[model samples]
Target chain A: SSRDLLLKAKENGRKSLLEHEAKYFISSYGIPVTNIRLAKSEEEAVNFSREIGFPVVLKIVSPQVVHKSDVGGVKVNLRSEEEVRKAYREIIENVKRNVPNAEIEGILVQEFAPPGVELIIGLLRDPQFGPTVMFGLGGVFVELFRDVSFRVAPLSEQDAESMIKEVKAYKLLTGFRGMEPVDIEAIKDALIRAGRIGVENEEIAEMDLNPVIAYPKGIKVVDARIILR
Target chain B: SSRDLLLKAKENGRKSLLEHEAKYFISSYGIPVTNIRLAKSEEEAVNFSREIGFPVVLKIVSPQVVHKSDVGGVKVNLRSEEEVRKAYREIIENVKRNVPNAEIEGILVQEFAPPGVELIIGLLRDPQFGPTVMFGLGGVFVELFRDVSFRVAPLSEQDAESMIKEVKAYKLLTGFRGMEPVDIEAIKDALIRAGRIGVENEEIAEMDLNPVIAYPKGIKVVDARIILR
Candidate 1:
């Protein structure tokens, strides 16, 4: 289960799980995440981009660089293998320039999540409440509005359902202003599974699944971060 | 409409609405509230208690004193006429001693909400988002856990539904453990109405409907506070 994912990370003395590792670990617990691959070189980046199909997103993976975008470590919506190859090299150069001597964990090539409502799902260890789940709209809504909801770990199905409805931007999920309503039950199950991971894994200090695009058919976790104990 | 309520409050040169005034104003927008009456004297306190039925709550209504409980101004579960009379006097004495210059509007005699899940609903004027609504579990859950959710005002039915489910303590509302499930629809309507008040009336700088008890059948606003620009 997710225990193996965490144990391996702890054994390596890694306090944070790289994006691919975080996504893979949570996927085992039943979270639906975007298909992603690790590309250690330009050839591999091109190959993985083709395999995953275009358009794709590439993110620089490194333990030292927590904020990938701050160091120009992210590239999105690449339509061809050439773009992926260039993006992979550019990300490496940017990281090297920004943080000299940091160990690079290669590049991540991921499927471009289909257009949908961008939502955030996360877990944080609370001093009093132990593991807690969080939900909110992503991007400016989360940044400027701070519209979000939270619940303790091991959430019931009902709890998960409520968490989805708690954000101020819930209308977006319910097909607001002519938008199609996303799969609410799928989102709820994802929340429940995430809460389970939080409760079962004592080693996970915090986790973030930001920009979880909610489409009418399903939801996809676009980005994931896991910090270990 | 609610404009009259605000006009009356501002006409009194009062920036903060007393509990009764706040409840009255919001109720006009279809926010269900406990039966409440302002008692100017010990006799009226006892009379109002009898009229509202036994097992009532009394709170001091003074604009100067925002934290009524801190000044020993709140008395709950008054079961009889004598208790109401005594509580009325004690609350007055406490306010007189603690807030010497505070104007005593009156003692708020309110129907004691039945035992049920306690939740909070509120609104505040945000610089960017304008009016925003907040929902959360009450008591120590809110104090210790900070389990709450927020949304900009003019909430739809769907928005209210999501807000109710956003709290970390949502299980408590969904009949967690052995607790009975609350009136979900009733709570949703209350939230929608509260948001309507926030959107329609820009004069309301902030509003708090704390301890909104959720019973199996319905909900009641136990206490309210409104601040004006």
Candidate 2:
């Protein structure tokens, strides 16, 4: 239990750097991931993705821009050597312009995530209620519909299952239409693990790891951020 | 103070069959409003509006239908006999299709409000904080930005003013660009009233009053709804 707590922030993809820096802890939690590494330049980035294999994601890590989509900071599905080089320069320039004050932690060149459905797993600390775990349809819909289910923190397996199924949009995950049914149990495991971290870490106020890609391949923490109290 | 509790739910231009049947007891403090009555048919609806005055809002009141817009169950700015007649038929038919379970209590024909900027005042019972009074820009954009200000219940006039100025969107209310500055004092008064109501009434779990129109003529409530424990 303490081993899980020690890596809770890192494993659940909490507030940390991009590229390979975050996945190390997340991988230990039994979530499948690609080989990754942090690189400082176009040359280093290309080399990292090559050793890990190409068609990777190249991202500049900065705590300043919590949401990458908001600032156009993350570049995904990089296939070619030329593309990786171009992405390296672009990410640096964008991060500099958008978050000039951020502590730049070089760039992350990781194995590119394949196709999958995205969902969000978040842990929020209420001043009164303390830690609350939530599961929801990922992306803009979360803000748009506010379609989500929540359970009080220190979640049991049963509590995690209910929150996952209670959302109105959960039919999408139930293999609606032709899509494959997600690894629902694996997803719940991640949620329980992350929730445990939320309860254990007093400094953690909010943890948002979105685009937790749930595919037949496995679960992946595509992007994440957390706020410390 | 007793009148404040009695006038509760039926504030502004919104008085629905739902209000009459459920009898939601809102602790309305200082927001000004006109009387509301339910009318079943075109004849009754027209007469009710005429007695109240022209340019009234006609709303289909059914507990089953949460979203009136989806069922075409709402008509606003109806000023003529022909308008009232058409609206009554449309609202009744839409309820039959979309909300068959709804107790058909006819349409609520309410007094028309003069043009002005609209604001939303709400109370959400957060488990941690208990009752929290919220002030924000109303309608769809409410969630996108969540441009809101909140105060713990039983807010003072000073607290209300502070909440109003705290939001990022407060700049919009302060007459963005060349728009005229609204009655900030009036809005502040309404906020304090809402806060007091939330504090005094434990039965009321949630209240939403929108478009508190601050016209040159006077401040009027345009639409409102409340849920009681």
Candidate 3:
């Protein structure tokens, strides 16, 4: 069962597909993710949004609109019933206009990630050296600084520590300048998951769970994407 | 000597002292930098702006304010004499008030680079490999894609081609869509200088010449900075 868990996390690239596949993917490793649904109607969107809570992010679940924000395809901070219905229609219309040929999968509806620092953890396949696990400051600055650490996959606990320490911005992890430090244990867990994914899956060329929202409460994989070889 | 040219680039790093230390450091390598000056007064500022040609970018140059843009320390496209004097005084006063301890390197006045695509050529010291040379579509997005090629320093002609082949943005260099293909020789020269700089100087810890303006007429270093050991 544990071996199966490792393989699924590593091989399964899409969360929407992984939603059907996550019970086997994350449960064996004891990682937690939020309940997710695919919404097709306004009532379903409202009910899902309400159940998930008022404030949430709505996303178009199509592959063609890979960068959601670039095309105004992502809506954040959704609260109240009116916003949910509007966001659903807007996302559909936008995806239709922007990504003309992309297969229209139903929109991904999930519980809103609460206030927290967004983090990124992933496994990268280097054409030269095979897979390396990476951790860094997530969102826009990720590219700016490329502030990251890496280690060969199937990483040891020591490798996780070394990767986190490799970044200059890790001082942000130590509660620098009066900011709250995130749960280091959670980051380590994410790194281990990445390592397991790398070791177990041959199909996955790269996997990214960007903006894995981290709060003192714990951590949640608020958003994710994976690339298969 | 190539060694001397390399040293000059490093010297530029020491002289410029602040503000993203990546560009000028690379310029000293014969990368074709626009002329620059530090105006102590409004009169000097206007004089230099006119001398260099108008529609220039003015930066409140101080080693202390690391990113002048963040401190509202950068003004772009100043087209007139009145704007030049006003921008000059404001930049000077801003530097004086905000980064009091930074060596007041005066205000660096330079001609605005003509409209063109921006690119980056750089060198970095790798722990295992010693020095590595890189070239790519240079801008915020370049880092986003990590769209660049790298070769061990003291690169051969072959290494340059391999590096160019590595990035998806390479299409931009080879006339992506309708854009004209850049003079590949210009990129080659930039890489040659970068590789040579790595071989010639060990003091240069890291060097970056980003958004090197690539106009149809010729290439010029627009902004740069570096760190020396």
Candidate 1 vs candidate 3: which has greater lDDT? 1
lDDT (Cα, tens digit) per residue for candidate 3, span B1-229: 4345346545665532353234455566667787777677677888889888888888876657667776678888899998988787777677667766666657878888776767888889999998898778865346544667788989887788778777655555555433576766677777888898778777767777776877555688877776667
Q: Candidate 3 on A1-229: residue-level lDDT in tens?
A: 5445335544555433333243235534555565567777768878888887868677776645667777777787888898888888888888788787876667767776666667788778888878888888775336544667788888888888878878755655666433587787777877887788777767656677767777665677766665554
Best by DockQ: 3
> Candidate 1 docking category?
incorrect
lDDT of 2 by residue, B151-187 (tens): 9877888888999888655654655433566888878
For model 1 chain A, the run of ten residues with the poorest summed lDDT: A169-178
lDDT of 1 by residue, B126-183 (tens): 8899888899887755654467888888898888888777775676777653468899
The residue ranges of model 2 lying beyond 4 angstroms of the native Cα positions read A1-35, A100-102, B1-229
Question: Mind giving the per-residue lDDT tens digits that candidate 2 earns over A1-229?
Answer: 4344335545655554343434554456554556657786778888887788768987776656666656777898888888988888888888888777777767777778887778998889877888998899775447545778888888899998988888766766766534778888888898898888678767666777777889865688876655644
Q: List the residue pairs that clash in candidate 3.
A: B21-B225, B21-B226, B22-B224, B22-B225, B23-B223, B23-B224, B23-B225, B24-B224, B119-B138
lDDT scores for all predictions? Answer: 0.85, 0.71, 0.70
Highest-scoring model, TM-score? 1
Tell me each candidate's i-RMS in Å: 15.3, 12.0, 11.1
Off by over 4 Å in 1: B1-229
Tens digit of lDDT per residue, candidate 1, span A90-201? Answer: 9888888999788877888888876888888889999999999998877645755577899998899889998778876676677654477889998898888888888988
Q: State, as a TM-score between 0 and 1, how close model 3 is to the true structure.
A: 0.47
